Amino acid sequence: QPALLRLSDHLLANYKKGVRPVRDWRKPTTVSIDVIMYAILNVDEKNQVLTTYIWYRQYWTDEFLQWTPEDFDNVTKLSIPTDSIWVPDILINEFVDVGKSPNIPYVYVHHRGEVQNYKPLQLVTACSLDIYNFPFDVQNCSLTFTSWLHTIQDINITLWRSPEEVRSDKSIFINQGEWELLEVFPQFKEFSIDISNSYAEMKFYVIIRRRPLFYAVSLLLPSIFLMVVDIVGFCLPPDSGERVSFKITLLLGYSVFLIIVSDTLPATAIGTPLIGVYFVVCMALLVISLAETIFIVRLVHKQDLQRPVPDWLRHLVLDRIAWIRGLLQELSSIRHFLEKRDEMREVARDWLRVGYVLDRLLFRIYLLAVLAYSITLVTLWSIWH
Amino acid sequence: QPALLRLSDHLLANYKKGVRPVRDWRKPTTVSIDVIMYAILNVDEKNQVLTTYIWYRQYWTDEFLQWTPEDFDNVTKLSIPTDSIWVPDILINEFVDVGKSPNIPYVYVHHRGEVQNYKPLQLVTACSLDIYNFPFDVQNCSLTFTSWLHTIQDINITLWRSPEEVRSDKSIFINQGEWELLEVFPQFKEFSIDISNSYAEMKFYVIIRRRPLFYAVSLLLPSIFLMVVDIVGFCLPPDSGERVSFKITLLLGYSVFLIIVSDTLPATAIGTPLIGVYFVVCMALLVISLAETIFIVRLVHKQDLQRPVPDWLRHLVLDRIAWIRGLLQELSSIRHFLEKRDEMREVARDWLRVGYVLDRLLFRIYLLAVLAYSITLVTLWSIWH
Amino acid sequence: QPALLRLSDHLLANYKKGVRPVRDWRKPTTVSIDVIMYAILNVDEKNQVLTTYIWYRQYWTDEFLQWTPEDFDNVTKLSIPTDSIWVPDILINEFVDVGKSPNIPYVYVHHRGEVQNYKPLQLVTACSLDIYNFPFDVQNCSLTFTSWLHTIQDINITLWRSPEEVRSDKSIFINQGEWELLEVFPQFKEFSIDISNSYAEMKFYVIIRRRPLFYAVSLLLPSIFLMVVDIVGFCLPPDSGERVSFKITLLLGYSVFLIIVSDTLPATAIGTPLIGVYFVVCMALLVISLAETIFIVRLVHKQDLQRPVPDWLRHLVLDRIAWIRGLLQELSSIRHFLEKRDEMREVARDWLRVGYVLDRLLFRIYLLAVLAYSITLVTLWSIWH
Amino acid sequence: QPALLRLSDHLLANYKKGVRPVRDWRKPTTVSIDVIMYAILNVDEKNQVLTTYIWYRQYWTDEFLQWTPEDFDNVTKLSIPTDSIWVPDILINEFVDVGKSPNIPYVYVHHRGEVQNYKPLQLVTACSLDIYNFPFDVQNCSLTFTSWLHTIQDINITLWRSPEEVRSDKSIFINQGEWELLEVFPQFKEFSIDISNSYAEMKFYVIIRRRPLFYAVSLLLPSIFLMVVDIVGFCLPPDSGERVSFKITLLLGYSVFLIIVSDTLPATAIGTPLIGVYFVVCMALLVISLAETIFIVRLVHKQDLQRPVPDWLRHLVLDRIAWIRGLLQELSSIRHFLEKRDEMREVARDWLRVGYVLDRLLFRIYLLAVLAYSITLVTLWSIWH
Amino acid sequence: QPALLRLSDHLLANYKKGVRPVRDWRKPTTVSIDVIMYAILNVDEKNQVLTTYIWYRQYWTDEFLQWTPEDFDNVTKLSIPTDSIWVPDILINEFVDVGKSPNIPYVYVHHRGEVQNYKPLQLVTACSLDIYNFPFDVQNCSLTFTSWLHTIQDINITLWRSPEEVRSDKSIFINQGEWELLEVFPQFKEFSIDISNSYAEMKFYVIIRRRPLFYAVSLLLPSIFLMVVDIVGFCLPPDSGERVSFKITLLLGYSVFLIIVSDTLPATAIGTPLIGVYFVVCMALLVISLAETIFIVRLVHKQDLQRPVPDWLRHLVLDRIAWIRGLLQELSSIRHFLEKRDEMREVARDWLRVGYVLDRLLFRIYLLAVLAYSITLVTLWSIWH
Ligand SMILES: *[C@@H]1O[C@H](CO)[C@@H](O[C@@H]2O[C@H](CO)[C@@H](O)[C@H](O)[C@H]2NC(C)=O)[C@H](O)[C@H]1NC(C)=O
Ligand SMILES: *[C@@H]1O[C@H](CO)[C@@H](O[C@@H]2O[C@H](CO)[C@@H](O)[C@H](O)[C@H]2NC(C)=O)[C@H](O)[C@H]1NC(C)=O
Ligand SMILES: NCCc1c[nH]c2ccc(O)cc12
Ligand SMILES: NCCc1c[nH]c2ccc(O)cc12
Ligand SMILES: NCCc1c[nH]c2ccc(O)cc12
Ligand SMILES: NCCc1c[nH]c2ccc(O)cc12
Ligand SMILES: NCCc1c[nH]c2ccc(O)cc12
């Protein structure tokens, strides 16, 4: 007789698969688990879910599947289909849709009754995401493995291995994605929602950090590009009537661009992300450039103004060294029309050189409000790097 | 003999799982339920559905699964697979797609015949959404648990616990999302669509309110930004020929922006939301700014107009203090060409100072139609806060 | 003995569930159905499908499930699982994907053999949509219930109730959506695709009408907004050099807006919708405004033109009352250069006042081509309302 | 005894459903099929798939389900569940996802052993799409029905009916969609991937043609609209300084529009579609309009140029008839400043009339490069119509 | 007796399908596989997955399904349902969702016990994508077939055929898509995650290359189009006041276009793709064109400047040959006002001809920075072609 199916006839003849396998019912069946995390497939932030592929394994002690290796040609391990034995109902408290993993149809059984079960499982799980510092963020998502029905008296959950070996496990993990795990942190916890019920659970805090190197060329590269167009835009002469149309076109291009980057961050009501506050301050610096162009074109215009006041013309003089026959009465009438002509040219000429020395020094103030304000960026960048 | 599977052989030997378990058929099997709501996953408003994760439990009385704890070593609870016993067909009247929850394969049975069943269930349910006051809204969505086939004579539905304990249940609930539940309100109701049929149902009015703090920085922050660009835009001199091109560019940027925010609110035919009516009034204030610029550039232009009328020049004078040899005949011909030259300059100069004192006071009217109209915003904001 | 499972042992002992239950095989099993329509979930027009939630019920006569209420304690109704009896294969000819409804696991049986079956069913069904008059449209979608395999000799289909009661059934229906049903119209029809096969079917013409009140504020509110910007745009003086840049900017904004509304209507080759033809006529009215601005700026320009012809200057005069020492030769040379100077100013001044009296009356023609053309809108609106 | 389930007890008592039913194993079981195509649901071109709803039927000869109509009250047809008999594994070589069709749970059996099986089946099938002539295209997609495991020796595939009747079958087909089938073309073919294996297959070449009447109002209606704006745009005078800003705005609007229509056509590397080549030639005609405006504004400008050369002024004269006391020395100084003034006006006046007669004839060349080039469109349209 | 179901009664009478079929348990069951790849359906790069349709087959040796062809009329092959025998649990380590393939319900068995199993299987598999050289890229995605539970002692994996025949297999493969496979490379590998467990696996490195011919007309055709608009844009005279509005409009159109092409490439943190670095250098060349227009309009303007310095006027002269009665005092006053008039015209005239000879030679430098920089494109194109 072949000895490998003589054994399965001995185990599964009178085996009843609907009974929690134990001889004294007062003790629990202590399962023992661990995770080996393979990949982080996607982090959906607007929906606050997280899909993950995990290699997973359990063992528990089945007191009805015991034998001796003699009378069976020293068989010490054996494979049984999963649908023909008892199996616990351990699942996750935090799933959203779990139908993506196939069922492994086989389990091992040892000669002491140690049934061990290997299966892959994908987990579209719901964990709250903190998105405050957007390119430089670590996440803290839980994976609470628990028995759904059975209490402490029936099913208790411990680990396969030591909790140090779970923390530093990068044995299989797919790198060169968007995320990168630091550690998987296990913790036993006894859960109770009311009196007279207590449930075992095993949380796995998987922490991951975003690799930020892509988002420099999608959130900072056009923003610094829209600044060097603004720096060269002050070198238009304000008398052209084309400088204000330059600045409103630039702010138009900035405004369309900010729409594009708004859709990524979620509607989580803990506030705004920290980088999104900067694009408001980046946008308000364009308005100070837009309010500076309107002021000097209001100040310098062919409008037939009044005289420049010498109280400020002396103030502009100090800053200029810092930042820069009755035929006589008839023919007298024709020169008087030209007396008024060139003099009103010189009135607008007096307002003219005022609007350039206020153009230069306010361009220096704008250049120091950019160049000294960029040092604040790299020092917050280098320390958090 | 081990006593835990001796009991399951005693219960499930001649048990027929297709019969509603009762000895006198004239009495119903009164199930009893409650919900423990875990999260609100998404509220799709354009489709008017609502997905929700709920911890759920039932018990009913099975008169065929009774035993005595003696002859079984004082066993008082026991686990049976769900597919091997009777189970009611309680489901929801308002689902759209329910396939996302796994089946819990186990139930408890007590020694009196009290079968109790724990299961998670996700509910893409269809509830009508009222979206009138958009950032500040409470919702009222039903969850009508009922038996689909059985009538009052067969299955009646009551609650597990007191209806006060269901209302104030925040024991497990995931916060820091978009929504926040106030209460879950149960109510028994007897349903009847015709004569000779009556059905038990248990409605659960779950009310939730949106946390509005995110939508201030996505529906009010660019709208107030497009006003301070409009306030500074009046400081262009109207003689530039660049002011009307400024105002139409601004209204262009506003018009593109209103497209972006239109896609959120649904096509529900109860009317428009209340905040969407304000963006029309916000848009019509830009037209009054756009109609004011066209009027003064029509009024002030190098066009060789007629004289300003002294009926309104005196009216502008009052508001200015409030808001602000035959050689003689040949040579006489050359001055007359300059007589006509400077005089038509002074005609346009007379229309010139009119268009600035009407520019200033209409800018004060526009500034008071903004600043006093913003007080209406925060008082409606603070009371509803 | 308990009498409720003594009955199910009597019915389902030798019952064979694979046989169409009848004693004389020459007669059909006449099923009888009706629908109770609950909601219209979505109408996808680009794909021409329609999803609908329907409460549904059948009964047929099973000649093998008969008993007498005596010997069973006057039991007259009983519940049997659906998978343990015969059930017809009645389904829809027009489905696209039907997997969204759960299976009701129970049926009633009466003491005469009247098995009745209640189930919900969702129907992503394919019906052709007529989209000609877009906001004001009724639809006519079929729901052809038929047996897929069995012919007239085996399965015939009739109704539960009278066909008048199906038509006026609004007992349960979720209102305050986008659609609103007028009636559900049943009609028996015998189907035959060839010789020697005839099939019963029961069509249900469900007609629904769109509530159009939302699409007034998404298809007419910006279109009338882009007209009042065009009406005020004629009050620019044509000498500014900023009026043509105003009109092309407006047509730019209109052109981008028409892209946004194009994606809703499908690629159904019965033609264009009727409202989409109007937006072409709405767009061509902007070109007549754009061709009118180009004509007067071509007519009025500092170009050193020729004289205005008195054949049309008299025509403009009639419409103006309707719509509105050798020192002498040397010094004679300097006045002749000013003779040519002011005269060519008066030549452009003669073309100047022509271009305003043609500006005013063509603005009246444009104002009457708008105001009288809007009366055509509301009269087609009020009658179809 | 009722005779309809006495027959099913006679057929399915010792019937083994895992054996290919034949008495001499050396002959094949010749199935016979046909398709009745109901609708073409969608053609996804970027993914190159095709979903189709097909009414489908098979018959094969089962030598174990034979009887005589006597001893059974002249029963000649009978219904058996599909899961209780043998059924071939005929499926499609070209599917992508086939889970959308329900299983018909019944088959007919005749008294000779002719089992016939009716089922609907939806087919998201993968066929390569040729998209060269985009609005006027026929497709040629295969549907290769074959047995997946069994060879020629076990399962052979023929047709139900004559192959002429399959070709001209429009008995049920949903029209008024986007597509329209010409014919379904069957062809038997013996498949072999290596030595010692040969497989029967039955290809069904379904050819469909797009109804092009919708895409005239979405690919040609705005393109001809952006030409009549270009035709009227030449009537701006080139001295305005607003004509180049008109032409770049138009090319901006064209460039945004071409983005919108690019997303439809796939990334199939057989080249570009033929209509997409025309929009490049449509775009390059705008550049010749844009290069013509830049040339005449470079030629006509207040720049203090040199003299016009009489070598080309005579050439412009020919085309103009085709396409169109020491007081004397002091006072002599003041006329010499006006000698230089009006003469440089006449130098720019000489370049002025040159730039209009080159404006008119190059506008005639552009008008003949449009009007004669539109005749090429309708002749390629009418023949392919 | 018919001999084909007499054989299946002999094999499957006492067959236990839950036992790994072997007589001596110490030897493994060596399965043997290969793949025949049919199509590459989609490559999702933002999600880094890959869907593939593969024809697949296995055989293993079943020691319990042996017979002799005599006593069964020389039957040497036979078909058994898959659910009635043992089958290994060979699956893929790298799947994401595998539910899209149907189950083939049949297997062959030979008279020696060689069970062979044919099935199609679709594989949304997760492989890391290298996207550095975007249009010209080869991919290297693994397909690791392994037994999930069984070790080396139970299941070992080898190939059907020689590993050379797998490499050059294009027998069935759907061409004329986006991708094109070079080879499928098999490699045996023994896997071990810890001590005391060793697993067989069979990697299949399928390498595919993108056909780049479509992306020339979607990533290079508008980019070279936005250069010839820039080349003709220098032929505007800088005195128009319309040239800077031309250049900012062009950069606006370029900036919107770069948004459109950004969404394809993923967020993989290995850096940026190589073609995306070029569009930054393509964008910075427009800024040098935009900084050149601002410089000459700052240099040439009616501003009443000072004199041009003869240190650079001589430098411009060298490059111009390379790149190009008390009535007397009263009447003396009127000429002095015209002395100042024409002289300040000649001051701006002196700056005028400077700004054209710097316009021409900087246009030659820009033309050589384009034409010589395009030779770098085609040489990198032709070698990698
Ligand atoms: C949600 O809506 C339901 C009905 O639409 C409200 O239920 C009503 O509650 C009042 C107060 O208890 C009862 O008098 C009515 O009989 C109830 N109506 C029905 C149809 O049962 C419910 O109060 C609403 N929720 C909130 C928070 O107001
Ligand atoms: C669709 O394509 C197939 C092949 O790609 C065409 O089938 C060919 O038809 C001709 C004419 O009957 C035969 O001579 C060839 O042998 C067929 N080819 C194959 C591979 O069998 C088919 O004709 C095409 N459809 C149309 C409408 O032309
Ligand atoms: N083929 C993968 C077998 C395997 C090896 N080590 C494992 C660890 C966990 C697990 O679920 C599975 C495994
Ligand atoms: N593991 C969660 C068990 C659990 C504890 N309390 C519960 C309440 C309801 C429920 O369905 C389930 C539970
Ligand atoms: N719980 C809903 C039971 C029900 C009451 N009336 C009905 C009518 C039809 C139907 O399918 C079902 C019903
Ligand atoms: N109810 C549709 C029955 C039917 C009638 N003719 C048919 C032809 C083919 C098929 O699969 C089915 C049919
Ligand atoms: N009908 C396809 C049968 C077939 C022929 N050759 C094959 C090779 C592999 C495979 O899985 C299947 C096949």
H or E element that contains E365 = helix E327-371
Distance (Å) from CA B55 to ligand 4 centroid: 6
Our CA dihedral for D272, D277, D279, D280, rounded to 10 degrees, sits at 110
D and E adjacent (3 or more CB pairs under 8 angstroms): yes
Task: Mark whether E and B touch (3+ CB pairs within 8 Å).
Answer: no
**D7 and D119, same domain (yes or no):** yes
Using a CB-CB cut-off of 8 Å, the residues of chain B touching A241 are 240-242
Write the CB contacts of A12 (distance below 8 Å, at least 6 apart in sequence).
A80, A84, E18
Ligand 7 nearest atom to the CA of residue D93, by list position: 1
Is the CB of D19 less than 8 angstroms away from the CB of E8? yes
Q: Is B276 left (phi over 0), alpha (psi -120 to 50) or beta?
A: alpha
Q: Could A298 and B177 be called an inter-chain contact, meaning their C-beta atoms sit closer than 8 Å? A: no
Residue B158 tokens, joined: 């009551």
Residue of D nearest to C304 (CA): D349
| Same domain (yes/no): C167, C307 | no
- Residues having CB within 6 Å of any atom of ligand 4: A 146, 148, 193, 199; B 36, 55-57, 118
Q: Indicate which technique resolved this structure.
A: cryo-EM
Query: What are the structure tokens assigned to B204, written together?
Result: 């659960």
Ligand 2 pocket, residue D140 CB under 6 Å = yes
Pocket-testing residue among D193, D197, D203, ligand 7, by greatest number of atoms within 8 A of Cβ: D193
**Nearest CA owner, ligand 7 atom 3:** D148
Question: C39: domain CATH number?
Answer: 2.70.170.10
* C71 Cβ contact partners less than 8 Å away, ≥ 6 residues apart: none
In single-letter form, the type of residue at position C336 comes to H
Amino acid at E168: S
Contacting residues of D for E39, CB less than 8 Å apart: 126
Ligand with the closest atom to the CA of D142: 2
What does the alpha-carbon distance between residue C286 and residue D260 come to, in Å, rounded to a whole number? Answer: 23
Report d(CA B113, CA B124) in Å as an integer: 33
List CB contacts (< 8 A) between A233 and chain E: 294
B221-232 vs B243-260: helix axis angle to the nearest 10?
170
Beta strand A49-61 with A29-44: parallel, antiparallel or unpaired? antiparallel
Whole-number Å distance between alpha carbons of B158 and D276: 67
Length of chain B as a residue count: 385
Same domain, A79 and A197: yes
Which position has the token pair 């004579």?
A: B153
- Verify that C184 and C70 share a domain, yes or no: yes
Q: Contact at 8 Å (CB) between D208 and D180?
A: yes
Q: Is the CB of D128 under 6 A from ligand 2?
A: no
Ligand 6, atom 10: closest residue by C-alpha: D55
Q: Give the span between the Cα atoms of A213 and D113, in whole angstroms.
A: 70
Tell me the one-letter amino acid at A151. Answer: T
Closest residue in chain D to residue C63, using alpha carbons only: D2
Q: What is the DSSP letter of E240?
A: G
The bound ligand whose nearest atom lies closest to the alpha carbon of C37 is: 5
Expressed in angstroms and rounded, the spacing between residue D159 Cα and the centre of ligand 7 is: 22
Backbone angles phi, psi at C213, to 5 degrees: -70, -20
Minimal C-alpha gap between E172 and chain A (Å):
28
Domain that holds residue A24: 1-211
Considering only the beta carbons, identify the residue of C244, C271, C276 that sits closest to D236.
C244
Asked if residues A29 and B106 have their Cβ atoms less than 8 Å apart, the reply is no
- Six-digit token string for C251: 């047509």
Cβ neighbours of residue B60 under 8 Å, at least 6 residues apart? B29, B30, B31, B32, B88, B114, B115
Does A91 sit in the ligand 3 pocket, CB within 6 Å? no
Nearest residue on chain E to D260, alpha-carbon basis: E260
Alpha helices in chain A (DSSP H): 4-11, 163-167, 216-219, 221-232, 243-260, 274-299, 310-323, 327-371, 375-384
Set of chain B residues whose Cβ sits within 8 Å of the Cβ of A198: none
Q: At B234, give phi and psi (nearest 5°).
A: -75, -15
Rounded-to-integer distance, Cα E295 and Cα C194, Å: 84
Instruction: Write out the two tokens for A268.
Output: 């989580």
Same domain, A232 and A171: no
Q: Out of E169, E188, E211, pick the residue that ends a domain.
A: E211
Cβ D138 under 6 angstroms from ligand 2? no
Buried b (16+ CB within 10 A) or exposed e, E61-76: bbebbebeeeebeebe
| Cα dihedral across residues E207, E211, E212, E214: positive or negative | negative
Q: Report whether B313 contacts B347 (CB < 8 A).
A: no
| CA distance linking residue E280 with residue B262, whole number of Å | 34
Asked if the Cβ–Cβ distance from E79 to D154 is below 8 Å, we say: yes
CA–CA separation, E255 and A236 (whole Å) = 22
The ligand 5 atom nearest the CA atom of B201: 1
Verify whether ligand 2 is closer than 6 Å to residue D317 (CB atom). Answer: no
Report whether residue E193 contacts ligand 3, using a CB cutoff of 6 Å: yes
Residues A278, A368: one domain?
A: yes
What spacing in Å lies between the alpha carbon of B187 and ligand 1's midpoint? Answer: 9
Tally Cβ neighbours within 10 Å of residue B123.
24
> Domain boundary at E211, E245, E272, which?
E211
Residues with Cβ < 8 Å from E367, sequence gap 6 or more?
A: E231
Q: Is the distance from CB of A237 to CB of E302 less than 8 angstroms? A: no
Are residues C159 and C33 in contact, defined by beta-carbon separation less than 8 angstroms? yes
Same structural domain, E34 and E125: yes
Give resolution, Å, one decimal: 3.2
For residue E61 the two structure tokens come to 């040796």
Number of domains in chain B: 2
For residues B53 and B101, is the Cβ–Cβ distance under 8 A?
no
Of C211, C244, C276, the residue at which a domain comes to its end is: C211
Residues E201 and E229 in one domain: no
The reply to whether A164 and A226 lie within a common domain is no
Closest listed ligand to the CA of C145 = 6
Inter-residue contact A270 to B180 (CB < 8 Å) = no
Site residues for ligand 6, CB cut-off 6 Å: C 146, 148, 193, 199; D 36, 55-57, 118
Nearest to E20 by CA among E214, E154, E129, E146: E154
Residues in chain E with CB shorter than 8 Å from the CB of A349 are 304
Cα(D205) to ligand 2 centroid in Å equals 8
Strand partners, C81: C106
Ligand 5, from C33, C38, C118: best to mutate by most atoms within 8 Å of Cβ? C118
Length of chain A as a residue count: 385
Rg (CA), chain E: 39
Are the C-beta atoms of residues E140 and E282 closer than 8 Å to each other? no
Residues C169 and C226 in one domain: no
Are the C-beta atoms of E123 and E168 separated by less than 8 Å? Answer: no
E372 and E385 co-located in one domain: yes
Candidate from B4, B42, B213 with C-beta closest to A47? B42
Nearest to E235 by CA among A31, A363, C42, D292: D292
A91/B102 CB distance under 8 A: yes
Domain shared by D156 and D223, yes or no: no
Tokens of E25: 């348990």
Q: Which residue has the tokens 């395009």?
A: E374
DSSP B196-221: T--EEEEEEEEEEEE-TTSTHHHHTH
Distance from CA of D170 to the nearest CA of E (A): 30
Say how many CB pairs under 8 Å bridge A and B.
Answer: 150
- Phi and psi (nearest 5°) for D41? -80, -45
When computed from its CA atoms, the radius of gyration of chain B, rounded to whole angstroms, is 39
> Closest chain C residue to D1 measured between Cα atoms?
C23
> Do the Cβ atoms of D4 and C18 come within 8 Å?
no
Residue D99: Cβ within 10 Å count: 13
